[PDB]
C-alpha cells in the first residue's frame, strides 16, 4: 500500500489478477449452489466474501470509498481453515473454551465501566493546563513532550521557571489519553488495565492534581 494513491506495476498486475480470482470464486459458488439451494456456517462466509468482492469490483469499475470495501479480502485466508477438517477440529476446540470465560469478560466489562465513571467524576478535564514559556500561546514551549501542570492555588506541579501555567492545551497524548467523557475515560481505563503505560497516566494525573490521593485509583 502506497500513500496518496501512488502505485507501481505490481499493484496493477495484482488488481488485474483479482478479476481472475473473483471469477473463479463466483463460478465455484454458482456450482455449489446449483447442487443445493448455504446453511452451513463456513459456506455463508464464502458466499458473503464473493458477493462483497463482486460489489467492490463493480463499484471500482463504475465510480472511477470503494477501496475501504475490499478490506473483506483478508477473510479469504480464513476459508483455508474450512478446506481441511484437521484445522477445523482444533479451531472448534479453541473456540469452545471461550464459553466459560464469558463470566470473566462480563466482570471485566463491569469493572471497566465502574472505574471509567469514577475517573470521570475525579479527573474531569483537569489535564488541560501546561507551561507556556513564550509570552502567548504559540508552540507550547515546554521541552519536547509537555506535561500537565496546575495553577498556584492547585496542588499539582508548578513550573518554577520563567514560564507560566496557562490553559488551552489539547492533552498529553494529542488529547487522546484523558477522562474528558465516557468514551475517552473507558479507553484510558482499558489501556491502564492492560498494564501498558498505566504509570504515564498516573504521573500525568499526579502533575495535574496532587500526588497524594490519585495513587489509590490506579493501584487498586
Amino acid at each position: 500500500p502506497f500513500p496518496e494513491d501512488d502505485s507501481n506495476a505490481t499493484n496493477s498486475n495484482l488488481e488485474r489478477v483479482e478479476y481472475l480470482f473473483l471469477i473463479i470464486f463466483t463460478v465455484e459458488a454458482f456450482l455449489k449452489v446449483i447442487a443445493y439451494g448455504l446453511r452451513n456456517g463456513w459456506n455463508l462466509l464464502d458466499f458473503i466474501i464473493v458477493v462483497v468482492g463482486l460489489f467492490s469490483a463493480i463499484l471500482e469499475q463504475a465510480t472511477k470509498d470503494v477501496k475501504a470495501l475490499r478490506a473483506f479480502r483478508v477473510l479469504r485466508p480464513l476459508r483455508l481453515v474450512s478446506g481441511v477438517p484437521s484445522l477445523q477440529v482444533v479451531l472448534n476446540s479453541i473456540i469452545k473454551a471461550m464459553v466459560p470465560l464469558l463470566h470473566i469478560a462480563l466482570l471485566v466489562l463491569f469493572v471497566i465501566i465502574i472505574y471509567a465513571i469514577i475517573g470521570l467524576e475525579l479527573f474531569m478535564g483537569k489535564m488541560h493546563k501546561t507551561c507556556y514559556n513564550q509570552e502567548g500561546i504559540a508552540d507550547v514551549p515546554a521541552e519536547d513532550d509537555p506535561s500537565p501542570c496546575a495553577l498556584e492555588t492547585g496542588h499539582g506541579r508548578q513550573c518554577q521557571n520563567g514560564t507560566v501555567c496557562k490553559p488551552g492545551w489539547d492533552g498529553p497524548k494529542h488529547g487522546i489519553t484523558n477522562f474528558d467523557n465516557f468514551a475517552f475515560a473507558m479507553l484510558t481505563v482499558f489501556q491502564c488495565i492492560t498494564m501498558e503505560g498505566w504509570t504515564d497516566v498516573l504521573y500525568w494525573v499526579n502533575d495535574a492534581v496532587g500526588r497524594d490521593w490519585p495513587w489509590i485509583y490506579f493501584v487498586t
Binding site: 463470566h103 462480563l106 465501566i113 465502574i114 467524576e121
Partner: peptide, 30 residues
C-alpha cells in the same frame, strides 16, 4: 467542595453483579 461521597452513587451498580448465579458463585469462591 468534596467529591468523596459522590462516588458512592456509582457503587450501587455493583449490586447488578449479584444477579447471575454462575458469576456470583465464581467470585465468592475465589
Amino acid at each position: 467542595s468534596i467529591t468523596f461521597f459522590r462516588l458512592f452513587r456509582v457503587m450501587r451498580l455493583v449490586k447488578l453483579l449479584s444477579r447471575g448465579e454462575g458469576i456470583r458463585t465464581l467470585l465468592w469462591t475465589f
